[PDB]
Amino acid sequence: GQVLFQGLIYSFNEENGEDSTKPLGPCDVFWVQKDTAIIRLHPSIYTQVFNILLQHKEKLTVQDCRYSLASVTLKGAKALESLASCLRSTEYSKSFEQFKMVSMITDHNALPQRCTFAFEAIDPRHLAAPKKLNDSQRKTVNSDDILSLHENYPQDEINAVFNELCDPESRTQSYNNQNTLKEISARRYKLLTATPNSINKTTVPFKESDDPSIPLVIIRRLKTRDWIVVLPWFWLLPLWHLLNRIPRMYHIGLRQFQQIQYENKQLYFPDDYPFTQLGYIENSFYKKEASKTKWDRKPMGKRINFEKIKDIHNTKLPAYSGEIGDFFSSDWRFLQILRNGIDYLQRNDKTLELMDGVRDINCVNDVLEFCKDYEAKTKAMSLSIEENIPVALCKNRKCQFRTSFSLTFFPRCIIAVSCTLLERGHPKDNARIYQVPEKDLEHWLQLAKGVYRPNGRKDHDLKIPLPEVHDLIGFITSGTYHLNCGNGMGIGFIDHHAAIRQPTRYVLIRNVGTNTYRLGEWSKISV
C-alpha cells in the first residue's frame, strides 16, 4: 500500500555474528516501487544514520537529499482548500481529479490512512491571484466517494512522479527554463492583447515547450495528523509565497509546533524523549546548565530555595532536607538508583527500615547518601556512561518483565503515559510523580468522588496526608495547562513494575518547588 508511517528507529550494529541494538529515535520511512526507499528524520541523528549506512554500501546505493529536496507541513481543516487554490496541474490527471474532491472534505480524520496524491504542477509564480477551485458539487458528497477512493488509485503516474523526483537528471531538467518575474510580467502584459477580445484573463497560459514542469508530492500523516508536501529545494520559495498569501494562513514555529504536538498526546525527540541517547544527553545538559546559570544569576533572597522547604515528605530524613531529586532538571539517575536500593531492601527482607567498599545498606538514608555521593563524584566528569532509563514497549511481550552490589548497572524501563488532573491543581515541567499509599486510599477516592461544603460548593480546604519518600515512580517532562479539555495535562513516564503494583489508576503529582500533592489518573500512550 506504500503508506507513510512514523516509527521508532534504532542504530543496529552487527560486525559478524553479534547484534547489539541501541535506541536511536524517530524516523519516517516510505517505499516507492519496492526498491526506492526514502528515510527522513532529524539532521543531528541523520548524520549518524548516513554514516552507519555508508559503512555498509557494498551492495547498496545511497543518495543524500539535504539541499535538493524539501518538505513543508500543513495543519488544520482548511489546509487543503488553500493548497488546492495554489496548486495547478499541467494537463489532465486522475490524481488531481481525486485531490479536487478531497479539498472539499474539510475533515482530515474522515479520510483513510492511504492518501498520497502526486503530479506535475505549474510554477507558483505563474498564477496572479489564488483563485479557488470549482465549488458546485459540495452538497453531493457522501461516503461512496471515500469508499471508492480506496479502490481507484493511479499508481502509475504517482510512481512516475516519484521516480522523476528521485532521479537527479529530471530534477535538474526541471530547472530548464525558470522564467524571471520580469518575464512573467511581460507575458501578463502581452496577454492583455489576445485574439479573444471578449474576456479578461489575468493569468498566463501553460506551454509544452517554453515552461518547466514541476513535480509535487502530497502525503498525509496519521500520527502527527498533518499534510506534508514535498518539493525540490529551489522550487519551495514560490510555493511558500503563494501559500502564505492566503489570508487564513500563519507561519507556525518550532515552539508552536511543540504546543500543537503536545496538545493531542504526542512526544518530542530532543525534549520529551528521555530514553534515547542524543535526546536525553542534550536535554539533561542544556536544560540543567541553563537553569543553573539562571539560578546562580539571581542573588540570595531572590530565588526559590529548593534546599530549605519544610513539609515535603512525612518522616523527614536528615539527608537532603529540601528537594529529593535535582533542583533544576528531572533527573532519572536518582530515580533509578533509589528504586534499585528499595528493591534490594525488599529483597533482603520483606519490610523496609527508614532510620537507624560501600556499606551494606539497611535503610533508605544510606541509599540517599549513595545517590548524593554518586552525584558529587559525577560533578567532575561525564554522566550517563551507559544509560539511566530504557523503554520496554515490546520486551514484556517478548519474554517477560524481569526485575552483586552496583545500584547503577541495570536500568529501569518506563512506559509513556499521560496523567490528567481530575481536580484543582496546575502542573509544570520537571514534576514528580508519586504513587498513592495503601492506608490513605479511601480519602483520595472520596476526594475524587466529591466532598462539598454545607454551602454547596466544593471543599479543598482540608489537611493533606503527606506521603512518604520512597514513592517516586516517574517524572513529568511536558506539563502545561491543557486548553482542549479545561484541565492540567501531564506528560510523564511511570515504571511498569509500579504500574502493575497498584490496583488503581490513581496517581499523585507534585511540583519541584511546591509542597502540595494533586490527584489524577494516567493513561497509557502507544508511542
Binding site: 461544603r453 454545607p454 454551602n455 454547596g456
Partner: protein, 242 residues
C-alpha cells in the same frame, strides 16, 4: 447562598394569640427578604424563662409552617425553620431542655445578668448566644467565658436590625457589637436580621460593608456567616431528626 436566622415572630407569651395583621406583616417582610435575595429563612420566637412551659408536645410551636407558610414554600421557592431564644436572667423556673430541643430546630439564649452568662456557658444545650444590642450589655464581655463557649461550638449572634430602629440606640448597639468583636476575637460570629417590618431589611453588600467597618475582616464576615449558618442549620436538622 444566604441565610437569615433572626426573623422575629410577633408574639411574646403563650397566652398571646396571633393577629391576622401580624401574620400579614410577617408575610410582607418575608417576601421582602426573598425579594432582596435570600435562600434560607429561620423565623425566631421569643419567650421568657419565667413563663410556664406547656405540658404538650403537639403544641410547643405556635407556628406550624406546613399549614401557614407551606403554600409560600412551594410557590416562591424558599424554606422556613423553627428557632426559639431563651430570655434567661437567674437560675430559676427552668431545668427543661430535652423536650424543647425535639420540637424546634435551633435553640438560642438571651443572658442579661452575671449568673445568666455563667449558666449559659455551663450546661445549656444551645447553639447561638444572643445579647440585647438595643440596651446596655449586662457587665462586660471577657475572653475567659467567650473563648470557652466558642471552643465547644457555640457562636455569638449579632443583630444588625436593632440599629435601624431609632437614633439613640445606635450608639449602644455599636459600643456592644465592637465589644463582642473584641472579646470573641473574630472566630465564631454569626449575623441575623431582627426586623419585623419590611422597611428594615438590607442586602449582602451593605451588611458586609457595615460589619467590615465595625471591626470584622472581609474573610471572617463571608466565611463565618455562610458556612456557620449552614452548619447550625445542618446540626439543628440532624438533632431534630435523630
Amino acid at each position: 447562598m444566604l441565610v437569615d436566622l433572626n426573623v422575629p415572630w410577633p408574639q411574646n407569651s403563650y397566652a398571646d394569640k396571633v393577629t391576622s395583621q401580624a401574620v400579614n406583616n410577617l408575610i410582607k417582610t418575608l417576601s421582602t427578604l426573598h425579594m432582596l435575595g435570600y435562600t434560607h429563612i429561620a423565623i425566631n420566637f421569643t419567650v421568657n424563662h419565667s413563663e410556664k412551659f406547656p405540658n404538650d408536645v403537639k403544641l410547643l410551636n405556635p407556628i406550624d409552617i406546613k399549614r401557614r407558610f407551606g403554600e409560600l414554600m412551594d410557590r416562591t421557592g424558599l424554606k422556613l425553620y423553627s428557632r426559639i431564644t431563651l430570655i434567661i436572667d437567674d437560675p430559676s423556673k427552668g431545668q427543661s431542655l430535652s423536650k424543647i430541643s425535639q420540637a424546634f430546630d435551633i435553640v438560642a439564649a438571651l443572658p442579661i445578668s452575671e449568673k445568666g452568662l455563667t449558666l449559659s456557658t455551663t450546661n445549656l444545650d444551645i447553639d447561638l448566644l444572643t445579647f440585647q444590642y438595643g440596651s446596655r450589655l449586662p457587665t462586660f464581655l471577657k475572653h475567659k467565658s467567650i473563648c470557652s463557649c466558642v471552643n465547644r461550638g457555640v457562636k455569638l449572634e449579632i443583630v444588625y436590625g436593632y440599629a435601624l430602629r431609632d437614633v439613640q440606640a445606635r450608639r449602644q448597639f455599636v459600643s456592644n457589637v465592637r465589644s463582642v468583636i473584641r472579646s470573641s476575637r473574630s472566630r465564631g460570629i454569626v449575623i441575623g436580621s431582627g426586623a419585623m417590618s419590611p422597611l428594615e431589611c438590607r442586602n449582602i453588600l451593605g451588611v458586609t460593608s457595615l460589619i467590615k467597618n465595625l471591626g470584622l475582616p472581609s474573610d471572617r464576615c463571608s466565611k463565618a456567616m455562610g458556612d456557620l449558618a449552614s452548619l447550625v442549620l445542618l446540626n439543628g436538622r440532624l438533632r431534630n431528626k435523630s
